[PDB]
Amino acid sequence: VSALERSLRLTFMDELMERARNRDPSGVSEVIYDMIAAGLSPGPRSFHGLVVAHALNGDEQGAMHSLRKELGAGQRPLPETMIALVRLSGSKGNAQRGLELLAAMEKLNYDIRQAWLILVEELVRTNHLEEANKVFLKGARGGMRATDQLYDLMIEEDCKAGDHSN
Amino acid sequence: GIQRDDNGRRIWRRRTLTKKDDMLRYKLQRVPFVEEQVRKIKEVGKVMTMDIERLLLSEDNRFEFVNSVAAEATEYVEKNRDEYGGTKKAIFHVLSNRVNDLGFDRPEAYAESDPYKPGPGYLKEYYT
């Protein structure tokens, strides 16, 4: 890794992250193809930027396509990419997609507790109390421990809904 | 307290008892004629009674201990049905594993046989 390659990667990554922070997944793909043309292999950081760009403007299908591209590229996705995907699924209420992402994270030797908390909290926030309860109970029977705030939130919301069983 | 004896080695004061404890001489003595007693204890299975008492020293409620042992034995039987019921008993296996989990070595499920059986077909006749 020379200083020339490092500088080229710095410029390309800065432009890619600037486009990703601007909710422009197409521009991020443009920068990725520019990296391919220039010989710079897209690392997990670039695919993370692409996934974030897709996820910021509520685009679950494109985010999953970006994850598939990252996997097919042979790169190992970052924990941030996976937690962004699970948060997007929770915001959309896609509980099963979130569980699949959690299983993938577990398969890639990652701590799924924080992502599980994010998923259940987002499901609660978007008024998906049934799926939130299901995912929370799956995680709790699986041995995971939730925060005190999450315990109180689940209990209070379930009792407000009249759901004594959960 | 730091002192080096000019060669890189650090000389330090060793800690010693420097006092008389009469309980040392009187207590570290061994009885010499308990071979048959120990062997009979192992044969009849009183070591398992000692183990059962030891396991209950860490249990607030003994009924909970019994329930947990029964549940673990049930799991053992469900997972490997064919390994139990004969020379290996599930509850004895659970007890031995719980004793072994503390770092104390025990034969598996307290399973023992008689090496002196005179071939197949001969059954020991107990002397009441």
Partner: peptide
């Protein structure tokens, strides 16, 4: 007594190589 108190991503998506 003992009755008291009621007693797949990452697959089909590997690197082509």
């Amino acid at each position: 007594g003992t009755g008291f108190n009621k007693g797949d991503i990452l697959f089909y998506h590997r690197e082509f190589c």
